Amino acid sequence: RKSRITNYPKLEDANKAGTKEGYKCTLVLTEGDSALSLAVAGLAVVGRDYYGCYPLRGKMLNVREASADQILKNAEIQAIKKIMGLQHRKKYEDTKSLRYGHLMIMTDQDHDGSHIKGLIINFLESSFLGLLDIQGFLLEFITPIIKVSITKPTKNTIAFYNMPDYEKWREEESHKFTWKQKYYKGLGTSLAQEVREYFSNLDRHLKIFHSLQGLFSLADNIRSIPNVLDGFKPGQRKVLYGCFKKNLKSELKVAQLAPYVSECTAYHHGEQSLAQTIIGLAQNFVGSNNIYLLLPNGAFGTRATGGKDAAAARYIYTELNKLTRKIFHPADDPLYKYIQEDEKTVEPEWYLPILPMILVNGAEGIGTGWSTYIPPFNPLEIIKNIRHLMNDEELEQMHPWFRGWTGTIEEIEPLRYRMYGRIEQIGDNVLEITELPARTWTSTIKEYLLLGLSGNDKIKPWIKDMEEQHDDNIKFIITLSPEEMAKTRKIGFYERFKLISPISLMNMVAFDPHGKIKKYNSVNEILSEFYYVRLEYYQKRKDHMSERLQWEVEKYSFQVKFIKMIIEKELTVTNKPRNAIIQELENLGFPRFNKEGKPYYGSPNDEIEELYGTYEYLLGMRIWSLTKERYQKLLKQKQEKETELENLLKLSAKDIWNTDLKAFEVGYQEFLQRDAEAR
Amino acid sequence: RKSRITNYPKLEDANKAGTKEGYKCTLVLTEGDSALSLAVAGLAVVGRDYYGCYPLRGKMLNVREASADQILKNAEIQAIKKIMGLQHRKKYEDTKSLRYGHLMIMTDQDHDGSHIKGLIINFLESSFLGLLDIQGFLLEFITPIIKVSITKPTKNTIAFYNMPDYEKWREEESHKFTWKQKYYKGLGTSLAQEVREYFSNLDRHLKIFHSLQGLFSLADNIRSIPNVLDGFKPGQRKVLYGCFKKNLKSELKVAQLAPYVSECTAYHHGEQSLAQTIIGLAQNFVGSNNIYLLLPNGAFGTRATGGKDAAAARYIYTELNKLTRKIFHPADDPLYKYIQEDEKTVEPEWYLPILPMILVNGAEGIGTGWSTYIPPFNPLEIIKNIRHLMNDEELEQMHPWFRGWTGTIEEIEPLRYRMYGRIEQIGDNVLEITELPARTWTSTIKEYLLLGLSGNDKIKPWIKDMEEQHDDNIKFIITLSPEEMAKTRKIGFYERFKLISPISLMNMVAFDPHGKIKKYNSVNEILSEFYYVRLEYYQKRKDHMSERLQWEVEKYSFQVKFIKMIIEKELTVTNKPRNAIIQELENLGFPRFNKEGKPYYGSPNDEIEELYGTYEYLLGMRIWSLTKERYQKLLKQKQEKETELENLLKLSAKDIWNTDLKAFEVGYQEFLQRDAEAR
């Protein structure tokens, strides 16, 4: 699929330019005649498959400029655009929609005098500077600072382009070879060799940068609709589970996190997809996550664009939000059903936080046959309500709520709200917009305020002038003609400034506890479903804990019987073989105990492990444990452990749940403080 | 102490140029008028204390050259020499003897067109290119590729000069700040800001590079004369001891090794001094160490110069020579007397290798009142002789010997030899020199062959022509006039080519075993002194080993008594308090045992540790050890350990020594193979 350039006769297009691989192509722009020859020479070495070349010739005499001349510059810019496939990528995106993925400039013969480089960079900077940020989008031919030749271990040469590289090599590798350096300023009038070297080098590098790309009904809906309970979709669950797996207590790049997460969770989608998910989980601008479980340590996206301006995976870092473990309590980990794939086991079918994360953060998604949208709600409300269900009291009603947001929400019909921003009249014909309805991005407004200012076609402009003094808030100051101000009162200030947006609860759908796609009919319907299962699982947690305690109590009990039976001579071990002494133990009823501390009481015959245990807990004890103080202590422990077991059993599932909710409430106060403080 | 420049009117000398700190000064060389103004501007920011400036103006029209003109270049070079203080440092040295420690070039206004840079580098390369290798001796003004501004954590800017630096920062730090980049090509006609930035940056860097400098009778002789026994001087002993301390089984830079060695051995001399010592210990060219204990992994110096051409400490690496531990046997470490300083303990008073290292490698040194020189000898001879002393047979005589060398040695009077290289007449009037007397450096010959070729004053030239085809050997091919060839037969081929050097044993001095400065009167006098002490220490080693075995035998013995006394009911522990049960143990005679395994038999009263021990070896045993199989095993171990002890006691000190010599002989065969193989 070759998009082809027809209007530019002087272009020598790459064979793959404008195709699926166009992003992998470099368009070599040359300045003046000599630059071109050199380009061509470098070109011969690398092939015309991934390299295009277009010349912008000229020069003339002097370095001067006073009488102007831009008919040229304008058109030169046009060429680069058409040729590279610009005006074809949406700002903030990546390189895929372009004819060329790079732009190399060749400036030469005279002083750097790149009337180009300046212009190129300049225009790049005021037109689609988002490109200008991409790794090595912009390239420039430069000659090596030092060349190195190696005689022995093998036979090859190394070209360095700056001291740091040379120096790091000299300190870390030089010693492993016999070599001599060759400071650069040993050339006549032929950069041909050096341009060939540059290209050879560049191609060798890009061949590596670009090698690093890091019926349908069920599959889609699964990956597209969240599971109520934890509010995740498989992709997010894998990240969370992954973070819990390696202990995420200190940051690491999201680009290092993604491969780890994919590895341990056999993710079948782009590593780029995961990194995106990690970023989503960490976003914290007003209108994203009410509680971000992942901490955005870097440019993770900003309110102005809704997070598409997030930086690249290799420059940003995340970590577990300190609060995340107070929501997804570690004590429930052993209760989950970890899905099996090949011979691994991955993330749970679902997690069960102490509060319905699906209502805390909300969710949105479109899959085949099914669609969803649940706005976010105030955690503090969710809790007051979980407590109502707990004390069997009527549930209070919950209305969408956004962290850090300050507009106002109003319910019209149940299941439907209208969300308002804020616009005051600060002076006779000067309006100050101090809030936008949540999820309405700061730019989408500016864009529209700009179209009503410099009224670009469609229909007549209508703003005298607009100013933007955004601090960490939103403050657009609008000034209108006495005639337009009064026209806005007729249509309505909020409606005209697009300061209203609706919130529909008409489509709250998510997989219920047994994989079935359900459409809930109320916040409260969702909260209850969750409450019942969560309550059950708190029982499951209690049981799991009491059982370990039970086994401990059992082990100490038998250690006491044993020592007693020995101390007051009813059991003698002094001599007699192994088998005899272990069988005789089985007969007296003493259980074996494996390494997890699980007791076993049956016949260990046939093929006999860790499946049964041993009497190591008895015979492996020290001689010291037959003495008085030790034995007394042994009894003291048995009793303290029995007491520990009782005490636990005296707590209701709800007692525990609430012990957890409280802990969260504390941490959530801290979380909100820290979150606002950084704003 | 300011050496002052008088003949160069246009020089603006640094206030500290030509002083003790001259090495810390940068002489900014400028090209053309505009370069100078810019230099001056950069100069204003950094001060004239450490920066000098000299202009080489000119330009003219074109880029052409055909009719020549070098009266200029010649003199321009002269200026740089005088000004920098060149012709004043001996090749291979360092920067200390110069007026200026750096040379920065400022090239500007036109195309790089540095008629200078080329010339500068060129002349640097064919005159004292040793300088050209020093870290940042040569500097060049360059403009930043990207500037970065930081708003928040603090407030500062960062200038990057190459992608790698920017990129490493972007990936490792960017995320910790709010910042925006600023691609460079945003300037009018004023590099003034950029030149100020460069200087500011450069000064900031050099202020760090140069901050990193890493009666007398007793002190001197101690640090100057080796101790026979190990053949070291305190400095070398500290390095060896240091290497033994951290386990040197994989390489690390000698610049990382030195600080470690100094730290753990409280070295009171320059870290630069140590690095030198480490290098000396690792050298392996023909004529250095017969056995290098430290492995030279990098340019550690070459035969051609006698090792002064060694690279810098930060680029080379060492490690323990695999054989080193077969010479300095680990089992003797506990027998040494480790000197105490402050509250540490350092290296031994001396080490005691299995063979007199002082004869293997030899030594040389000059201190106050005393002087020394002991050539190297063949390890294989030293051993045959140690064995003679062992079987009480007459010692054979030993003559100096060099590893990898191939000349010939002849004794004239006892205590004096003449060492010959090798020179054959390969054709009628063509001589081929294939060996130089050991310790006669490949360059000192070439230098003298060059003075006899292009007979530079003194007296008439005498070689028709000379060729140098050195592979990993030495091959100077000399061609002489029929008249000169016959004149060389009169003076003697070897004498005329300087192919003879004497080796005097007239001054073999080193500290003897009790610190006294002794002058030995024979190789054999030295070998014997050593033999007697080494033999004693092998006894000491035997004792030390037998004692640990004894204690093991003692411990097992008492464990057996205990279990027996319990199993056949003569001792009961089942109940009774601690104190009672431990005192009753003391009465039965059972010793306590500390953590090193040393038994104690006395009353542990008063202030009672690790000074006495406990009965943990008894009571801490498992209940399992009272059963039959365990007890049987316990007896089996006691017996095997008793047998182990006996067997050891059946070996004479000599038996052990020889078991060690043999191990060495194997490793030394491997060492020689590996050493030649790499040549």
Swiss-Prot record, chains A, B:
Which annotated residues bind Mg(2+) 1? 31, 108
Q: Where in the cell is it found?
A: Nucleus
- Reported modifications of this chain: Phosphorylation enhances the activity. Stimulates decatenation activity.
**For Mg(2+) 2, which residues are the binding ones?**
108, 110
Where does the record place the site Important for DNA bending? 366
Topo IIA-type catalytic domain location, by residue?
225-661
Residues the UniProt record annotates as site (Transition state stabilizer)? 314
Q: Where is this site: Interaction with DNA?
A: 59, 62, 233, 267, 273, 441
Which residues does the annotated region (Interaction with DNA) include?
498-507
Q: What are the Toprim domain coordinates in residue numbering?
A: 25-139
Changing residue 233 to A has the effect of: Strongly reduced enzyme activity
Effect seen on changing residue 237 to A: Strongly reduced enzyme activity
Annotated function = Control of topological states of DNA by transient breakage and subsequent rejoining of DNA strands. Topoisomerase II makes double-strand breaks. Essential during mitosis and meiosis for proper segregation of daughter chromosomes.
Miscellaneous section: In yeast topoisomerase II can substitute topoisomerase I for the relaxing activity.
Record note on quaternary structure: Homodimer.
Query: To which protein family does this belong?
Result: Belongs to the type II topoisomerase family.
The protein's name in its UniProt record: DNA topoisomerase 2
Q: Which organism is the protein's source?
A: Saccharomyces cerevisiae (strain ATCC 204508 / S288c) (Baker's yeast)
Lineage of the organism: Eukaryota, Fungi, Dikarya, Ascomycota, Saccharomycotina
